[PDB]
Design an enzyme around this catalytic site. Structure first.
Site, PDB file in Angstrom:
ATOM      1  N   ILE A  67       0.827  -1.202   0.000  1.00  0.00           N
ATOM      2  CA  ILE A  67       0.000   0.000   0.000  1.00  0.00           C
ATOM      3  C   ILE A  67       0.864   1.256   0.000  1.00  0.00           C
ATOM      4  O   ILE A  67       0.546   2.243  -0.675  1.00  0.00           O
ATOM      5  CB  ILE A  67      -0.980  -0.026   1.188  1.00  0.00           C
ATOM      6  CG1 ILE A  67      -1.858   1.226   1.183  1.00  0.00           C
ATOM      7  CG2 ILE A  67      -0.237  -0.175   2.510  1.00  0.00           C
ATOM      8  CD1 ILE A  67      -2.899   1.233   0.087  1.00  0.00           C
ATOM      9  N   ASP A  68       1.963   1.245   0.741  1.00  0.00           N
ATOM     10  CA  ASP A  68       2.822   2.409   0.884  1.00  0.00           C
ATOM     11  C   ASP A  68       4.275   1.978   0.769  1.00  0.00           C
ATOM     12  O   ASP A  68       4.609   0.821   1.046  1.00  0.00           O
ATOM     13  CB  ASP A  68       2.591   3.111   2.230  1.00  0.00           C
ATOM     14  CG  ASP A  68       2.843   2.197   3.416  1.00  0.00           C
ATOM     15  OD1 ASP A  68       2.764   0.963   3.248  1.00  0.00           O
ATOM     16  OD2 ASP A  68       3.122   2.716   4.518  1.00  0.00           O
TER      17      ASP A  68
END
Lengths: 218, 990, 416
Positions: A67-68
């Site tokens: 996600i990041d």
DNA sequence: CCATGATTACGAATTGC
DNA sequence: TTCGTAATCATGG
């Protein structure tokens, strides 16, 4: 295998041929997002935002996504830690060692394996602020992910909450598997068995399984 | 201590609770916090066989558990149902616990909370202060809801606070975006607890070069520099963008009761939050009543299409009119202007003329009672008015009279005296106004924004969302905020659970349900004779009650794959399962090899679904009766909301029986309901088709025999009526479906048709029908042209109306908003539909007479248009949106756009909307055969002049025109011949 | 999805796809259901001729080595696999075998997981073993196990070749003489040690020969197979009715026949004629007589008899009157359960040996008159369905099915 | 052989500037 | 989840 110029930093993006038929649209978005992006210092540097674009999409089968990016000491290649200090990469290496039975190891790199691609949904993130750049990247991330999905065989997601409704994000129906949190409490990730279903479907998809041991660093 | 409930909401923190928001008589707000448990239903042996004791257990008594599985039988030897009667217990667990053999696992925890504690979601209660502990200012904690909510008091009126908002951004070529387009105007309507209605508008300064602000302030507006120096009582405030966003955030953070916005969960609130975050790092925080949880705004999505919701946890209801309108009932277009068209309307009289203005008077002596008041309410902020549903006018002077209104408008003179008034589209182009920005544009846009903001309040009061929410919360046993977010499978579990507890029965399925696998067309389309409409009174609920079709009252399903066993089974069926105790229903087989399938239902003891349906019907009838005898407006609104709720919850049972993952799944009962409905419909169609009125007597076409088994009623086809002797009419049957039946009478006298329809309804209800089957006369239709119940146009007269009454112009199926058809085809269809309606009433139309005239007119008009070339280009312009989200390789539109970009300095982006038309060389003649039309599409720019070497490809437009016209009309061969003569192709009908 | 059940199910589908067999209806239904479940849950998924190489009919030199030679017989071929019922080539249907034989076959199959399937040769109600295919165990190894269980085993020859050998006619004759089997030898299949591919040799040659007539011979309980006689009186074996019709045989004509060194067989008609099968069906019936009906691949009687079948089908003593028949059924203790678990129409159909689909189509086109849970009168409704002559024959013989049905219903009522 | 019929695929019916 | 029109291919009169 050419280059394009952008009004703002990094002022130049070098791309592979397979990335040609979407990358055009990419620039028209990066022109209306980079102005607010450079205000805050972010990791990695803007020159390293698009270094993952060199990996061709022809000879890849498995897609692993996060996600990041790494908030600190980022390099551009997702899930990469030269010093082997990040918790997520350490847990991934431990799980791979447990699955393959290898006891002695020094590090793991997902880019060494031929057939798997390490990708980040959000290509940038401010240090100390996790997932604080979704609005800037949303459309570019969706475009790049739908380009990847058209060439990979099976796509595996890390994090239940992050990819809760990832199916609606992609219009093309493609075999998708959603996993649990990489560092979930209560040792939830220890019981995860996605690395086996991945190559079961790979064989079912008439594709050669993945030799995970190649990702080890000695 | 007397409190009326408003909303129930939950907190999703580490320690979860339940919250109640209530108001007292004075107006103060009280929050109460309860602990939320997990509820489980177990058998006595399982309760005594739990190693760790549960937190608390409450006895439930004797319950009968029945296995409702369905087994296919091929003989007539059937094993009986297996039922177990045992003591049951209800247990509560603070955390989730897995139980090996728990039952009743398809019910929510909130429903269990409400039913076990005996609390109504919107009841007024006199609370007890002993069980409440104060923890903050306005928030108390309760631990024994059973005794604190024991006393109930009659309902009392309470005040409320409302907020309505509207946003206007900046755009030049494409849809607005946060990164390059700022916010220009904000409009706010505010209602506090004191009953005072405030109304203000904030304007940006960044487009208002200094001297212009000086002049604007000199005109009378107020300029502010900081957040603290704003007063709400001043209508127009002129400030910067950052201050505007700060004011918006402060307003959205207050503890309101309703924040109503039209499609604001996708555009308005999202834009405000994104722009506020982008300009300043400061965020918007929602806080729990106990000041223990803080959240930020993140609009999330639900798939059902996509519906957006807010993540607030303070008790305020962020309500969206768009979703409520989409799911409440079906329209043609869901635009705001179309809804205003269909909602606010009236009839007015012309009191003056001259120059380019008209004077219209509107009063209750023109249209009806209450329409004038609503129009006057809308007129306070209105700026544009639609006349005759065709022309748009600008309001110059408006005066609200004592019981009506009078307004002057700018429109051309029209030779009439009474016209129609409504609020709709505005002849304002926002793109051009932003190019040359000035104070006149700023003030006009502020007025438009405030009208848009007030339209939400007007629609909210029109639809009665408050009373509907309260009624749904009471009936469905659900919190107020969850009433309009769930489908039929969720709003049904409350009453079902109550009925199960009252009846003391449980239904269990101990297997897996296999995924086992009609459009009606009228006899003719054009009628030119009066049509009487009758409405069945809840056909499927009455069928379910009559047949006792319930999962637990199914004796068996007997199937056969050959005729010998079929006949033997039928004989033993009539022998050992006799009526009226048992009912045998033939049904379509569920397997390709079965030839016969018969379901057997028992009517000795009432089921579960019939009980629920009868309860709902009785409650709705009672509420209708109570509404008909009420004089106060509030009581009328409450009763109407309750009856509407009961209707919408009682009309969902049939769909729920056939749904695999529902709580009332009964596949055989579904087939039985469908079969009995079809049989009743066909029997009524047969008995009505051909029935005539001779002398003072009536004859039907077939015997009035019961279509299921023998009955003791009179079966004489000849009946005695009370109508005048001289009447000698013949009746026909045309259309029939589940919810209505159509009849055809050959006359043009509306009063005669109405009285004969009333007599027919009385006779059918009294004699022809049986048990609880009845029909109601709805309306009379004239000039009916229809393809289905989806697409038809006609004129409608209600049952309680005389000849000298204003007709209702019924027209639906057509969209008239499809922006990819034309500007000319719509006008031609309108003209020819008007001609058809005007000519069908002449009297001598038959079948092969109207088609000739309409085809001749079409041919002549098309030939004249082709030979004249007098139509401007702007009438033939189409539009599309440019986007690269395309599959395949070329998709020729992209190639055309790229070629236009290369050959013209003007640039078309990937979000802009571009016009195009069909242009061919000026020398090509009429062509019959047709080829790829994608080649002839040309992009029309602002400066494009149609040269002498080009013309418009007329044949495509005329082919679409003739196709849509030929979709109507009766004769087929004539239409085929005409279409082949013109374009040499076969029309695609239906 | 974290539990191992999904991944176990996934390898189960992988194994099923590796050994796919469209003939088994239940297996294909389960596969389709699981494919639907996977493609709905995951939104998408990625999903015996080829075991035999080209046939050899000419002499050629062979590679020296160790080989196993087995005889391919002339008869209907069946393939039996674990988890699926019996399968015959072409039709894809199943058959019926004694439960003891099925248990023995299961015990053979589950011993070694490498055996893909086993070969069955059927000819006039006689099941024998011919060959087998296994990726780990040689068929010779499992032949001993098959013989131990009581099932018959073929004649396997293990020959080690040192020098180059030409597989000419004389060598084939020597191999046939060494084999010494009374049953017909249609081919010779040889497998090399360590090789999974299966290779077979069948010399053949064609001629033209005359037929005097075509008869049919009795084989047992209402089972008949056509028999063709020639001028010389030698018998030409015929597979089934399907082979006869597809060969397009004609009475009293010269036909092309493919001959071996011991027997000659009719071969299929590969011409471009316009002859239709439907009229050939009635012509062959007329030539052979209207008293036979085609039960698929064979011929069956139309005899009246009537009462002398329930004893045969139930395997009890002879019956004379109704009361003693009831008593004889009464004293039965084991087979009686078959009466109490199986219907009456199916029991009568089994007693008279009618086909399933044809009789179901027949009974769905006529009308009856049922009285006192019994049928007394019957008549036809639509006459088109009698286009097939076999349907006409069954319609004619219906006057005995009605009587046996009445008797079975009477005894059922008397017993309970 | 080719007019007629039937599949396939595309995309708005979308809504808020 | 709908309807609607064009572009293509396929099939029996």
């Amino acid at each position: 295998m050419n280059s394009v110029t952008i009004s703002h930093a990094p002022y130049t993006i070098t791309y592979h041929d397979d990335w040609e038929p979407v990358m055009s649209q990419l620039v028209e978005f990066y022109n209306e997002v980079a102005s607010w992006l450079l205000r805050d210092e972010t990791s990695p540097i803007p020159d390293k935002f698009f270094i993952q674009l060199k990996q061709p999409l022809r000879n890849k089968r498995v897609c692993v996504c996060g996600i990041d990016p790494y908030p600190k000491d980022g390099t551009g290649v997702p899930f990469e830690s030269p010093n082997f200090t990040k918790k997520s990469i350490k847990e991934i290496a431990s799980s791979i060692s447990r699955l393959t039975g290898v006891i002695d190891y020094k590090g793991y790199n997902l880019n060494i394996i031929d057939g798997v691609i390490p990708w980040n949904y959000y290509l940038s993130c401010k240090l100390g602020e996790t997932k604080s750049h979704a609005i800037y990247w949303d459309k570019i991330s969706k475009l790049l992910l739908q380009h990847i999905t058209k060439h990979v065989s099976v796509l595996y997601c890390l994090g239940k909450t992050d990819f809760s409704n990832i199916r609606a994000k992609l219009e093309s129906p493609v075999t998708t598997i959603v996993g649990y949190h990489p560092a979930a409490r209560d040792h939830q990730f220890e019981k995860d068995r996605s690395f086996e279903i991945i190559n079961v479907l790979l064989e079912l998809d008439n594709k050669t399984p993945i030799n995970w041991a190649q990702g080890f660093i000695y | 201590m007397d409190v009326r409930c408003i909303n129930w909401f939950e907190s999703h923190g580490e320690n979860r609770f339940l919250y109640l928001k209530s108001r007292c008589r004075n107006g103060e707000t009280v929050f109460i916090r309860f602990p939320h448990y997990f509820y489980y239903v177990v058998t006595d042996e399982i309760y005594q066989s739990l190693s760790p004791p549960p937190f608390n257990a409450r006895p439930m008594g004797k319950m009968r558990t029945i296995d409702i599985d369905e087994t296919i039988s091929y003989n007539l030897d059937i094993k009986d149902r297996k039922c177990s009667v045992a003591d049951m217990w209800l247990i509560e667990e603070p955390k989730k616990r897995s139980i090996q053999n728990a039952t009743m696992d398809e019910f929510f925890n909130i429903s269990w909370f409400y039913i076990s504690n005996g609390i109504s979601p919107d009841g007024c209660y006199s609370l007890d202060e002993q069980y409440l502990t104060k923890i903050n200012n306005g928030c108390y904690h309760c631990d024994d809801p059973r005794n604190c909510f024991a006393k109930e008091i009659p309902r009392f009126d309470i005040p409320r606070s409302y907020l309505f908002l509207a946003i206007a951004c900046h755009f030049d070529k494409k849809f607005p975006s946060v990164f390059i387009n700022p916010i220009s105007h904000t409009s706010y309507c505010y209602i506090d607890l004191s009953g005072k209605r405030l109304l203000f508008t904030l304007i940006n300064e960044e487009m208002l070069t200094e001297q212009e602000i000086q002049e604007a302030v000199d005109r009378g507006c107020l300029r502010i520099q900081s957040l603290m120096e704003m007063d709400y009582e001043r209508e127009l405030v002129l400030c910067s963008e950052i201050v505007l966003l700060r004011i918006a955030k402060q307003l959205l953070e207050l503890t309101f009761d309703y924040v109503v916005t039209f499609n604001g969960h996708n555009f308005d609130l999202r834009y405000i939050t994104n722009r506020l975050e982008l300009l300043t790092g400061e965020k918007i925080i929602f806080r729990s009543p106990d000041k223990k949880e803080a959240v930020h705004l993140c609009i999330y999505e639900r798939n059902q299409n996509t519906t957006f919701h807010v993540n607030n946890n303070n008790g305020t209801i962020f309500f969206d009119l768009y979703s409520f309108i989409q799911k409440s009932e079906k329209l043609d277009s869901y635009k705001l202007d179309s809804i205003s068209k269909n909602a606010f309307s009236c009839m007015g009289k012309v009191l003056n003329r001259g120059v380019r203005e008209m004077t219209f008077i509107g009063d209750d002596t023109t249209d009806a009672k209450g329409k004038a008041d609503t129009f006057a309410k809308v007129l306070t902020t209105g700026n544009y008015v639609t006349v005759d549903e065709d022309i748009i006018c600008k309001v110059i002077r408006k005066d609200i009279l004592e019981n009506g209104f009078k307004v002057v408008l700018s429109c051309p003179t029209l030779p009439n005296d009474i016209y129609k008034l409504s609020f709709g589209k505005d002849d304002i182009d926002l793109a051009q106004m932003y190019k040359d920005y000035n104070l006149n544009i700023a003030l006009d846009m502020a007025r438009y924004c405030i009208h848009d903001a007030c339209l939400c309040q007007y629609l909210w009061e029109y639809y009665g969302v408050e009373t509907k929410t309260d009624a749904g919360a009471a009936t469905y046993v659900l919190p107020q905020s969850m009433v309009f977010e769930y489908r039929a499978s969720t709003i049904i579990k409350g009453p079902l659970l109550k009925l199960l507890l009252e009846t003391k029965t449980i239904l269990v399925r101990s297997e897996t349900k296999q995924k086992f696998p009609k459009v009606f067309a009228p006899k003719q389309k054009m009628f030119s004779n009066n049509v009487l409409i009758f409405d069945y009174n809840s056909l499927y609920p009455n069928v379910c009650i009559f047949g006792n079709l319930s999962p637990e009252t199914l004796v068996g399903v007997v199937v056969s794959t050959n005729r010998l066993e079929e006949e033997i089974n039928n004989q033993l069926l009539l022998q050992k399962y006799p009526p009226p105790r048992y009912i045998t229903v033939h049904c379509e087989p569920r397997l390709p090899n079965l030839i016969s399938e018969i379901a057997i239902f028992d009517r000795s003891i009432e089921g579960t679904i019939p009980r629920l349906l009868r309860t709902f019907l009785a409650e709705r009838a009672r509420y209708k009766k109570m509404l008909k005898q009420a004089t106060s407006s509030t009581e009328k609104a409450i009763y109407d909301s309750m009856q509407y709720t009961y209707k919408i919850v009682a009309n969902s049972v049939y769909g729920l029986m056939g749904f695999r993952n529902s709580a009332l799944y009964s596949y055989a009962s579904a087939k039985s309901c469908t079969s009995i409905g079809r049989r009743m419909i066909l029997y009524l169609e047969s008995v009505l088709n051909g029935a005539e009125l001779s002398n003072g007597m009536l004859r039907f076409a077939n015997t009035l025999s019961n279509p299921f088994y023998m009955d003791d009623r009179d079966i004489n086809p000849i009946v005695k009526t009370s109508l005048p002797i001289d009447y000698r009419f013949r009746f026909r049957s045309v259309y029939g479906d589940t919810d209505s039946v159509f009849t055809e009478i050959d006359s043009q006298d509306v009063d005669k048709s109405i009285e004969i329809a009333k007599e027919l309804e009385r006779l059918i209800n009294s004699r022809v029908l049986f048990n609880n089957f009845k029909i109601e006369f709805e309306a009379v239709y004239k000039n009916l042209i229809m393809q289905s119940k989806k697409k038809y146009t006609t004129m409608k007269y209600s049952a309680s109306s005389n000849s000298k009454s204003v007709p209702e112009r019924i027209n639906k199926g057509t969209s008239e908003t499809r922006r990819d058809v034309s500007k000319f085809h719509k006008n031609m269809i309108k003209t020819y539909k008007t001609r058809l309606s005007e000519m069908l009433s002449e009297g001598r139309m038959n079948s092969n007479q109207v088609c000739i005239d309409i085809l001749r007119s079409l041919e002549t008009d098309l030939r004249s248009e082709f030979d004249s070339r007098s139509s401007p280009l702007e009438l033939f312009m189409l539009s599309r949106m440019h986007h690269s989200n395309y599959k395949s390789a070329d998709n020729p539109n992209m190639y055309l756009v790229t070629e236009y970009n290369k050959n013209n300095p003007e640039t078309i982006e990937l979000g802009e909307r571009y016009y195009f038309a069909y242009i061919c060389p000026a020398n090509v003649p009429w062509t019959k055969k047709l080829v790829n039309i994608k080649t002839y599409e040309t992009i029309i720019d602002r400066s494009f002049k149609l040269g002498s070497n080009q013309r418009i490809f007329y044949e495509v437009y005329f082919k679409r025109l003739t196709s849509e016209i030929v979709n109507l009309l009766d004769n087929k061969v004539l239409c085929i011949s005409f279409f082949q003569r013109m374009f040499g192709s076969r029309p695609t009908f239906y | 999805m974290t539990s191992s059940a999904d991944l176990t199910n996934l390898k189960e589908l992988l194994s099923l796809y590796k050994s796919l067999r469209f003939s088994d209806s239940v297996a294909i239904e389960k596969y389709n259901s699981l494919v639907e479940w996977g493609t709905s849950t995951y939104w998408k998924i990625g999903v015996i001729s080829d075991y035999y190489d080209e046939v050899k009919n000419k002499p050629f030199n062979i590679d020296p080595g160790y080989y196993i030679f087995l005889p391919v017989y002339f008869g209907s071929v069946f393939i039996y696999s674990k988890g699926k019922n019996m399968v015959e080539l072409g039709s894809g249907n199943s058959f019926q075998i004694p439960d003891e034989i099925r248990s023995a076959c299961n015990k053979v199959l589950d011993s070694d997981n490498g055996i893909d399937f086993l070969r069955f040769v059927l000819l006039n109600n006689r099941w024998i073993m011919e060959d087998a295919i296994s990726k780990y165990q040689s068929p010779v190894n499992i032949f001993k196990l098959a013989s131990e269980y009581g099932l018959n085993i073929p004649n396997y020859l293990e020959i080690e070749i040192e020098e180059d050998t030409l597989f000419d006619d004389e060598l084939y004759s020597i191999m046939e003489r060494s084999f010494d089997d009374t049953f017909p030898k249609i081919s010779i299949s040889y497998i090399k040690l360590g090789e999974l591919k299966r290779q077979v040799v069948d010399f053949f040659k064609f001629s033209f020969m005359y037929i005097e007539s075509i008869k049919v011979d009795r084989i047992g309980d209402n089972i008949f197979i056509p028999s063709v006689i020639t001028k010389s009186g030698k018998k030409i074996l015929v597979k089934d009715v399907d082979h006869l019709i597809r060969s397009k045989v004609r009475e009293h004509t010269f036909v092309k026949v493919k001959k071996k060194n011991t027997f000659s067989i009719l071969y299929d008609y590969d011409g471009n004629g316009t002859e239709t099968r439907g009229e050939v069906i009635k012509r062959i019936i007329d030539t052979i007589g209207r008293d036979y009906y085609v039960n698929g691949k064979y011929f069956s009687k139309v005899g009246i008899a009537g009462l002398k079948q329930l004893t045969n089908k139930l395997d009890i003593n002879e019956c004379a009157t109704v009361d003693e028949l009831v008593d004889e059924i009464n004293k039965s203790g084991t087979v009686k359960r078959k009466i109490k678990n199986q219907s009456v129409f199916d029991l009568s159909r089994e007693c008279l040996g009618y086909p399933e689909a044809d009789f179901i189509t027949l009974v769905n086109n006529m009308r009856f008159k049922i009285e006192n849970c019994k049928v007394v009168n019957f008549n036809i409704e639509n006459t088109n369905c009698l286009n097939n002559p076999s349907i006409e024959t069954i319609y004619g013989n219906f006057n005995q099915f009605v009587s046996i049905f009445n008797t079975v219903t009477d005894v059922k009522k008397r017993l309970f």
